[model samples]
Target: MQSTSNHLWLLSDILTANVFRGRHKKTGDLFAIKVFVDVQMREFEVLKKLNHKNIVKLFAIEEETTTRHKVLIMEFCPCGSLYTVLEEPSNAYGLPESEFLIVLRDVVGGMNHLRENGIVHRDIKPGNIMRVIGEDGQSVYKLTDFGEEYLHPDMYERATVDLWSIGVTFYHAATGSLPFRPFEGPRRNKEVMYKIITGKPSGAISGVQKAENGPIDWSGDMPVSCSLSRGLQVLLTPVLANILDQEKCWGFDQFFAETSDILHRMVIHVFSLQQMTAHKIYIHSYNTATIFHELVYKQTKIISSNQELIYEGRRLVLEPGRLAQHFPKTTEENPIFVVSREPLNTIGLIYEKISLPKVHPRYDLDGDASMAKAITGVVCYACRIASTLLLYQELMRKGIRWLIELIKDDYNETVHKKTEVVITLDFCIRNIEKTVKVEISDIHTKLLRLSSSQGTIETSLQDIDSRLSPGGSLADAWAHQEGTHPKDRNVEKLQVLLNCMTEIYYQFKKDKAERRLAYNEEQIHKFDKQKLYYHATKAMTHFTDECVKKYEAFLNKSEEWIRKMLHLRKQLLSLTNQCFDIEEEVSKYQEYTNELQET
Candidate 1:
């Protein structure tokens, strides 16, 4: 009873429960309290096990005050149901392509979570999905009202049941009506059921695709009124077909994988199907033939077989291959394909085929002349060739070592200053945020109280003036009374009121004077805060622009020194080797001279 009293307002009633817009007494946070008359713990248990962003959160299970029924407190979704959105006249055909995608992704994500936790949502309809405004002020759809009894509960346990229900729901959201109504049939429900059981019904909004539900009508065209882009329809076709078909239905993993894939790759703008105006199309996993077919279907009332799409003067073949293969990365400048209802004339527009090999540059490619020369010098000057080269090598090594010392010293200085600047910038940021935030809030409260007190002072002044006015009716009444002494008491009451008003006036004046400094302080804090931010940003800009540029310059200079060092080292080695050869040649003459002296 105490918990139920927290429900300050009755929101609405669902089929099995009454939802109350409620608040927490202690925390004062809002929640939705769902009270079920003949409550089963099935939904509660399932919801308790689930914790996902797409699934509605469970707060607690309590009882109603009057009815004493079990009430479940859940997260409130203020935007109402997805069914309500679909019920709008603007969405008479279906939800707009953008919103439908959101619905699709939300439901798929929720279902994936449910399946992972070994739970199946038996009732996966638009009405069961609740929409809430997210923290970023966008519509976030969450799955709620889980585990309800079906008309026949035979397939409640299986996960496939959820998939089938979701498929029907998505179909409705996509085209704005159920897929298998069989409205004209004598037994409408039976006919719809039979159609569902037999095969996948026609997704086309047109009524001509109906037949006795033995084999599915797979080639049925979508309703002409469908606002979905042709690309979306093409992408949605296979998903709906696969899920709705009992034999070809995907598992939850495949469902999430494909749906997420679509969501990721589905950009909002692509080539227009008919006009110069751009329209979005999802061409993944589709061929030119199907693409052209959809274009034909969209242009004409029916899918005409006689149309041809021409690109760059070539008649596009109606083949089962990717359209991406034939088309290069298209732009406004590139030739766009034209759908011609008639045959082309003899101004031969030869299509340029894309070359097979594509080349892109990679780093560490020894292609520059200077780098090749350096390598060649290293190859020629192997080792120990010349004395002068060795001297040059020693000089170069010393030069590099000196440059290294300079670089190390410079870097230490740069790093120390950089660290100091960063710390000061961070301090400035923190100071501005904290000081400005406190002052703003304080000024707001001070101003509010000042306004309130001033209002009271004005009211008191009005009352005093009205009571002390000349020729007052109350004064005449006092004159008629004998020994009434009403005048004396009235004077006392007026004096009391005057004293109270004076006290209030003085207090209000004091408050008003005190808040002047507060207002001034607020402005001072704001101005200083802005100055701090400006300095911080300016320091950051200097860090990126000046400091980093100097670092790169130093790096390039160091590279020059290293290259010189390598070149000198290689030359000295080769010179030292040639000196060894000269010594070898001199040894023969020295041996010959020694032999002559001995003889």
Candidate 2:
């Protein structure tokens, strides 16, 4: 297709049309020229009126010279289609939450713009959305193709079709796959699609089956590679649910409000307090210290008035927003202390006045008063040691419980992560196994080719050498033709041998069978046919050999990963065993502490 003054060449071919990545010779600007037979003017009519940042810009419409077909010259997006982005192996589950949010907002903005202009994007799949890098180097997703699909009857029912398509597209972008897919069923079957359309009203879309053969699943579960955070998932779930169902789908107004709310509450997390025990209190960026005081009081029964909060050896005011200002990085590990206003109590205060020995003025060494003081002092000192031992025993019990908790958490997290890792690792190794076998097969084939080529070339060289020999057929022909003389015969024999060598060289040169196999025109003209064949045979053999060499390293690396993962699994068992042993030790210590209490 030719624009005003620029030449266009096809960069790639698509199912529907040919896309040309063109550069203007004068302006030095890039443009994507989409050439289609009998172009849809209705789609381009709406596109021409669009001027939003999230909408792909239409520069001009041109015509192909030969076919005389209309072409779309639009802004070239460097990042390509969202479908291609999601097709990456790493994005098998979905895009990362942060990146997904950008896409979500951009699509929302684009759709909102379209809605304002009375435009309904009937088909809103990932392929229709184009991504471009902004001036700030961030991704900006734009709605490109305004196309159609396998339509339903109620498609025009209050723009439900657009909302439904948006839900499905967003779901795919979030999870790298279509939402309603029939297990082991054909992709474009009307039966499955009809079931989804019909079942949407009853909210039984997930229960729909393909003629009792297999069930169609809604995008209810996150894939192993999903990087969507739980907070985003919680927010996005209800939005999708509301949008996909025709009976309860929200309008553009509600969609905008709900998404804005999600953005507002994105900075929330479980902010834990180190009270007498750990108390997980939900905190938001907008939360004040008074709310914290209230939550902490409920957990510990220590009123905000009686105790002062101490953080980093400094007293913090319990007033609104004061604590957060003073202790900005307060976490469960680094928590505020609740020191009371009361006087300090010591071990000395544990004794009663009646148990104390009577004070006497007289210095009598053997007197009853002196004797009682000595006995009372000894018993009180022993009681102090026992009390200290009991306190230490309680602390040890807490430690043991904490260790048990660690073991529980370790097993749970490790087992869950290990299962995922094993599956992914196995997938990697399986692909590696299949790929390496292909290389090995090619190497074997090339090895045979190399041997065959060498054998043919060597046979030709040996034939020439044999003909030049003195005891060969060529020497016998010369001996019968001329009279024999020792000196003169040598000259004639040399001349005949040289002549035979020249003839043989020219014979092999002109031979068709020894020339390289002409698989294509490009291969034929590049180099000497037979020589190119032999060199490429050797080159390919070495290339395959290089690939085989990497197999050892890749296999060894995978084996090490298996070893490390299994070692962690084994260590969990050992930790569990050690926990039991430590529990026994704790029991023994408790018994000793009880004996000390009796004494």
On TM-score, the candidate that comes out on top is 2
Candidate 1 Cα outliers beyond 4 Å, as residue runs: 1-8, 11-15, 26-28, 37-46, 148-158, 184-196, 199-219, 271-278, 283-599
Most accurate candidate by lDDT: 2
lDDT of candidate 2 over 140-176, digit per residue (tens): 9998867522244365222776776777777777875
Per-residue lDDT of candidate 1, residues 1-599 (tens digit): 23575454444333245777777777778888776533567657757767788998987777667667677788988778888776543454567777888887788788777777877677778888999888987678998876621212235223666776777677778776666554444244454555444544534322322555443334454554455766677677777667653444677678778887787652323222122222344544334645645643463333446443443334445564455445444432233333333232212111122211211122112221222222222211111112112222222233333333433343344334434443543443345446455644554454345335434533543443343344421122221222212233322332333333333333333344443346665454334333433433443343335433433343344344334433433443343343344334333332332223453
In terms of TM-score, how similar is model 1 to the real structure? Answer: 0.43
Relative to the true structure, candidate 1 has a C-alpha RMSD (angstroms) of 38.4
**Each prediction's RMSD to truth:** 38.4, 39.3
Residue 412 of model 2 has an lDDT of: 53
- Per-residue error for 547 in candidate 1, Å, reads 62
> What C-alpha lDDT do the candidate models reach, one value each?
0.49, 0.51
lDDT of 2 at 436: 60
